[PDB]
Amino acid sequence: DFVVPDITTRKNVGLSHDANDFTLPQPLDRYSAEDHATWATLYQRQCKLLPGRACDEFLEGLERLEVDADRVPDFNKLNEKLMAATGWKIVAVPGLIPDDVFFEHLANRRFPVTWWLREPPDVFHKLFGHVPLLINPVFADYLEAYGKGGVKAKALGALPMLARLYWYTVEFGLINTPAGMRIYGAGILSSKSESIYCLDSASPNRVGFDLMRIMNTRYRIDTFQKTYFVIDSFKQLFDATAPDFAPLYLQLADAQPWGAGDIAPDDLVL
Numbered sequence: 715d716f717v718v719p720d721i722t723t724r725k726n727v728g729l730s731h732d733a734n735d736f737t738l739p740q741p742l743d744r745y746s747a748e749d750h751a752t753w754a755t756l757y758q759r760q761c762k763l764l765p766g767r768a769c770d771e772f773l774e775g776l777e778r779l780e781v782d783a784d785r786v787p788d789f790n791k792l793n794e795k796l797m798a799a800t801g802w803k804i805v806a807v808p809g810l811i812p813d814d815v816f817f818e819h820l821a822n823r824r825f826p827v828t829w830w831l832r833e834p835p836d837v838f839h840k841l842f843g844h845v846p847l848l849i850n851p852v853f854a855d856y857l858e859a860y861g862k863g864g865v866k867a868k869a870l871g872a873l874p875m876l877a878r879l880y881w882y883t884v885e886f887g888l889i890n891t892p893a894g895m896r897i898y899g900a901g902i903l904s905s906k907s908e909s910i911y912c913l914d915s916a917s918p919n920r921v922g923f924d925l926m927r928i929m930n931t932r933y934r935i936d937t938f939q940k941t942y943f944v945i946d947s948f949k950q951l952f953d954a955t956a957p958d959f960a961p962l963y964l965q966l967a968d969a970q971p972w973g974a975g976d977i978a979p980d981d982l983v984l
């Protein structure tokens with residue numbers, strides 16, 4: 715029955731965005747005291763739960779970028795540190811943006827960050843979850859290479875195959891370490907409960923990273939992942955982008971995808 719405006723619409727009232735690249739100056743005046751307090755609450759919650767769960771590089775990135783514990787960060791201030799580390803910067807966007815625009819940003823070492831915050835894929839998820847690893851030069855190079863692939867993928871109708879790769883790496887990836895399994899996916903790192911389940915539960919599959927397998931795997935957004943893909947190094951991700959994806963897309967185009975909860979005959983199951 716009744717339809718009401720969504721959070722993206724409400725938050726962006728009176729604001730504008732580039733019609734081509736979808737950026738805007740970060741609207742600092744729009745963050746209320748409640749927003750800063752919500753940020754602080756989420757930050758404190760995650761920083762209590764993540765030690766021994768997040769990969770070490772993630773927690774180090776928070777500190778090296780001086781990500782504010784007590785307020786929504788000033789993007790420009792964060793950029794001074796990020797630019798010096800890896801030549802990356804974050805740019806504010808209104809919310810969900812078109813894929814070609816998103817890929818063009820990453821291809822140019824710009825990471826789009828939704829500016830607004832949830833009330834008590836918002837700025838907490840996109841900044842706290844996604845940005846700290848951009849100080850890692852190997853991970854940053856993986857994201858740049860990913861972005862550069864957007865033109866080819868769009869031309870071939872293969873953007874959803876790249877979306878699966880992004881989902882199962884950047885958003886929901888795990889990294890194995892001698893100290894045990896750790897988390898690098900931003901969607902897990904900003905989550906209250908998925909960081910617990912993804913390491914502690916016997917329920918989800920933990921499967922070794924395989925590029926073709928992943929690009930042939932469905933995902934859903936409404937639920938905890940049924941399968942997590944595990945890398946041994948960020949180098950594995952960057953190296954996965956080396957070959958020509960065009961013949962991989964065409965091979966996959968006619969295949970039946972793996973379901974979100976499937977185990978494939980060739981999986982290294984961890």
Ligand SMILES: [Co+2]
Pocket residue numbers: 835839840844885900901
């Ligand atoms: Co995300």
